[PDB]
């Protein structure tokens, strides 16, 4: 549809003010943050799954911070 699969980004030459540039930073995060605020109860058990498996410490967060970004808009 027209809602998703935007032209962005051209990335050919293009040093200029495009149609939407400064709003491109607000595409995902804010809409995904509005999703995780929409569903806080998920966010509590979300990061729990990272500490469950692998016992490798620092890469357990690699699960969470990536997986917490999966659930919004699938």
């Amino acid at each position: 549809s027209v809602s998703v699969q935007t032209h962005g980004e051209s990335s050919l030459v293009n040093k200029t003010e495009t149609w939407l540039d400064s709003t491109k930073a607000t595409r995902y995060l804010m809409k995904t943050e509005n999703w995780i605020i929409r569903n806080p109860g998920y966010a509590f058990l979300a990061a729990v799954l990272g500490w469950m498996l692998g016992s490798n410490n620092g890469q357990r967060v690699v699960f969470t911070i990536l997986l917490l970004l999966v659930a919004p808009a699938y």
Binding site: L20, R38, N39, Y74
Partner: protein, 500 residues
Amino acid sequence: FNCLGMGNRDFIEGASGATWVDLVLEGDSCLTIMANDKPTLDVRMINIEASQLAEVRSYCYHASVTDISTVARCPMTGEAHNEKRADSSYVCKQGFTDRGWGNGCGLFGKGSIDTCAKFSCTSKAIGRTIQPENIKYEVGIFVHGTTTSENHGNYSAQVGASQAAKFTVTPNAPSITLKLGDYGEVTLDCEPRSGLNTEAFYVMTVGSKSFLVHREWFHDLALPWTPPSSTAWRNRELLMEFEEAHATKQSVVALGSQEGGLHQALAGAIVVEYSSSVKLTSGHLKCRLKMDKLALKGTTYGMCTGKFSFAKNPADTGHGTVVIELSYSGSDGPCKIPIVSVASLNDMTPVGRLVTVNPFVATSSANSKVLVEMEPPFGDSYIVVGRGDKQINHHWHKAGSTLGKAFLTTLKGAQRLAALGDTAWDFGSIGGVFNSIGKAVHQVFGGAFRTLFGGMSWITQGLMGALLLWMGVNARDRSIALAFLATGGVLLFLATNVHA
């Protein structure tokens, strides 16, 4: 108002023991009650009505740019100020214009400008907030007497026979007592306020049509919105944009109509019409049916002495029962219509039960059509109308044998558990103990768990469930079901419930 030819027709098996029962109903579905001494009843919602709706706010989806004004200034001057920042109708924004000695300035590399454009809303959506007392419910109720293909689907006709009734339950008057006439009176005690959640959502009007939206999502909509009264709006810069600044030239351009985006923002919204009072399609209401004064008359009748005929040919209702319409040519009426549902012709023992109890001829007039429904058993059966050699019979077969029907109760029972929340156990009517704790265990389980991570959309909770099924693979003894708890059921079920 009745259960005739409705899309979803569900039944009620009377165990007697009480004259009152607590049942939940819906606009599309029609409940059918069959009990001893109590004739066959129809209970369904016509629609959900609401009387007074307050104006929460509005949203301007479509805007246009008017009166582009940009006040150019020199570098090092700091802020640029256009006189249009006084009025809120003008949309103003800071900025800059890179300057040379060629254009307007004696310095290089920088600049300042104030770009103002008068805001003009071409089109705006409007939302509504629902008050609990204003909610009305039109609940069609019907009892099955002697009926035709006309009067049975007719309301005012059965009101003359007092076999059908309508009414409006509100929080101000949740209890309504209506009389069925010759069959007695029934008392219906509903819960209008608690049937739906009045403050859980709003009513949003997109274009000419209006639609339902969650009120917490309603305020979270990103689009220029409007206060109730008149003028000053917020985030109206979102439908407009800016460009590079060449000398004094910068073009503020407006986004097109977002009406489509609003229709794109609507997915699970229910289409709702209106005229004087809004009529909602899918109903949710908790009512109490008191049958105490509902009874059976005519205990002294007898059988009809004369030939029958088929006014319409038999067919299957698709809900598990078989209805027929009979035109009785005998003049001995009024008389109790002989009829049964039998296994074989050589066996006169009735097996199938009549959906409409005590078939009866209205008047002595010959060729009077009568529509009576029955539920035959599974397998090969027979519809036999009358006794002695003037009976005219019909062969019936129903492949729905209790093996599959046990799942139709089971599977749909879990479907009855889903989407009805904690009210799903109201089909546990005349409950207590099990049915009481069955809702109570799911009460806090409905107030936590599924509702805590609720808001997941389709594959979101469905896909991770398959990954949560892997949590049941890696576990320890006595810890097996711990990671498996929420996985099976309540999660993948509703994912399989709605496919699509």
